[PDB]
Amino acid sequence: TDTYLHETLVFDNKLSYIDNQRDTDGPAILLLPGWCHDHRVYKYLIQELDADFRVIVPNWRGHGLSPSEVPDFGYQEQVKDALEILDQLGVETFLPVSHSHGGWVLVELLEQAGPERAPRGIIMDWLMWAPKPDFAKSLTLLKDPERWREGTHGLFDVWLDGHDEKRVRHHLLEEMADYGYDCWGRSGRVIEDAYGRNGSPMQMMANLTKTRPIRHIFSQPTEPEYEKINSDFAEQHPWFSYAKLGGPTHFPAIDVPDRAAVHIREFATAIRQG
Ligand SMILES: Cc1[nH]c2ccccc2c(=O)c1O
Ligand SMILES: [K+]
Ligand SMILES: [K+]
Q1: Which residues form the AB hydrolase-1 domain?
Q2: Is 2 exposed, middle or buried (CB count within 10 Å of its CB: 0-12, 13-18, 19+)?
Q3: Which of 125, 129, 167, 186 is a Cys-bridge partner for 218, taking CB atoms 3.0 to 4.6 Å apart?
């Protein structure tokens, strides 16, 4: 799966990215990582989609197999980076698929690219409501140079949700091991700022200039009150749908890749039929 890893200069930065360069009919599937991890989170999903689609995964500034400190940037800049990679690659039409807070990039990308280029989106496990106290606390911890690691640990607890989930544990404990405070502290500032300025992922989506089909596929939070704000949002908005995947962790791309794949294919086929 590292047979597909590339690197390129993007404005000021060398960014790594996955591209299987599959010669096939569009749309390209653009898999967008959350904060302080990289394309490795997608290694099982990429396998599900490899045969039939062109699959691109950009890594954000300072992210990759060798993380590095970089100057401060936000989702605005993640969006420009992603488009610049698509331009360099000649990719025209694409279906963006995001993980968690990679969603802020996805929804701004939909605005920027417009519905012709980006006609649909799939958002995975992304907190739809404004920060509850435990999560609000997590962010404040991430921002703290003394307590960022404690922040990440509390988040790992929430994400694993009491499961001995060997693939996810490996991703959190090994694949994110090289990320430091420069990343984690930034993710805290950006995510906090994102909800502050946009209200919520739902408010930001509802506010798109040109709304279009978006599906939220998620395994957590598992409580019925969270399902309820998804169903209420979907009752109000013909373009919004959701699917509870019932996977153990915050990482359906890792733990139920075959289920995440089928929703991606469904949206990719709807696009092919216009
Ligand atoms: C990979 C990743 N990174 C984060 C960093 C800060 C806050 C939330 C997250 C998150 O939800 C997620 O999935
Ligand atoms: K187990
Ligand atoms: K709906």
Answers
A1: 27-149
A2: exposed
A3: 125
Binding-site residues for substrate sit at 35-37, 99-100, 159
6 catalytic residue (yes or no): no
**Residue 249 Cβ contacting ligand 1 at under 6 Å:** no
User: Is 37 near ligand 1, meaning CB less than 6 Å away?
Assistant: yes
- Give the active site residue among 39, 63, 216, 250: 250
The resolution, in Å, is 2.1
C-alpha 190 – ligand 3 centre gap (Å): 29
Rounded CA separation 204/220 (Å): 20
Counting ligands in written order, which one lies closest to the CA of residue 231?
3
Among residues 177, 190, 174, 150, the alpha carbon closest in space to that of 70 is found at: 190
Beta bridge partners of 215: 122, 241
Residues 262 and 31: their CA atoms lie apart, in Å, by 14
